[PDB]
Design a protein around this ligand. Structure first.
Ligand code: ANP
Lengths: 184, 184
């Protein structure tokens, strides 16, 4: 049993599916808020996990994710949500106007912590930003403008199952899983 | 004396000026770092104030400023530095192309914290965004695209003295000086 400090129940359902295999492990949501600090996703998740651990003192995880555009120097990055709300996807495309490098990537950092300390687990998916919003009604925010790896479709035109093995979130949770598996 | 948890010494030089008259004039820089949480400017200042106070256990002030543009919904706001270092002035001007509402404002929040608790002091200069970068060498970051109150020159084209009145930084501090003027 490991606690996930978040308000989104779906993150627990998602975590439990990637880890269903670990017969002896279970993920449970814990409604403890923590400050999300300014800094890298790593810094946000480490601080976050320690903050909740100090309070719950039981095995727990936190998570921070972001969208990074190359020609934009990694922006929006850890403030990807704030940017989505204020300038959104249109803002991103305006800023990429005339840029030849449309490369970008999503990345998730899970922050684990227990009596032994904090451990970071990462996942990334590299791709490129499309020139227009392309959507089949499938994703959130930046998904209508991100094309993963060798695909021609954006995340917004792919089903949950088409993105299940390639996503940063998926990749991050497989890393946390490795850690739980080969764990002593 | 009151400490200023800051790395810029000109900040404690700017602060002590405004503190001129007061008989407690003493503002003392102190190299104590604090987490700048994601939240409003007021949130960052409050968290930062109490954080370095619990460390130092003495009266201290922190200070957080931002550039907020109207058409862009507040952005960069409390993430002005990150935005300034990734997409720069160039980035907000592109975001603003074709927009007629070029309204914007700078804001500062001084977080004061005592053995009593936190008190916030604010300063604000409203204005508009320049159609292009304009500098004579003064100021930094967005100063060269911000035209204060009712001027025709940007902050970067005005001398430190010239914006003696149109300074969100001093306005926030004059506010702090009236709170000190009441304690004897
Ligand atoms: N209906 C839903 N409501 C809220 N959250 C959901 C829902 N469906 C799935 N989720 C969760 O939200 C996450 C995906 O968010 P999304 O914005 O697509 O990506 P992200 O990389 O986490 N964020 P960002 O980097 O800001 O784009 C998954 O981890 C899911 O657990």
């Amino acid at each position: 049993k490991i606690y996930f400090a978040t308000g989104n129940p779906n993150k627990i359902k998602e975590a439990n599916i990637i880890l269903k295999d670990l017969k002896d492990v279970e993920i449970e949501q814990i409604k403890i808020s923590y400050p999300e600090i300014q800094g890298t996703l790593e810094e946000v998740a480490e601080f976050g996990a320690k903050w909740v651990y100090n309070i719950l003192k039981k095995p727990v995880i936190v998570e921070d994710s972001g969208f990074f555009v190359e020609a934009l120097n990694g922006f929006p990055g850890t403030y990807s949500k704030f940017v989505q709300e204020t300038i959104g996807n249109e803002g991103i495309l305006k800023l990429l106007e005339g840029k030849d490098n449309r490369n970008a990537y999503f990345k998730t950092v899970i922050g684990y912590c227990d009596e032994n300390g904090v451990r970071l687990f990462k996942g990334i998916v590299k791709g490129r930003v499309s020139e227009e919003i392309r959507s089949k009604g499938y994703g959130f925010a930046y998904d209508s403008i991100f094309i993963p790896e060798e695909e021609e479709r954006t995340f917004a035109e792919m089903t949950t199952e088409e993105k299940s093995q390639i996503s940063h979130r998926k990749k991050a949770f497989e890393e946390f899983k490795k850690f739980l598996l080969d764990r002593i």
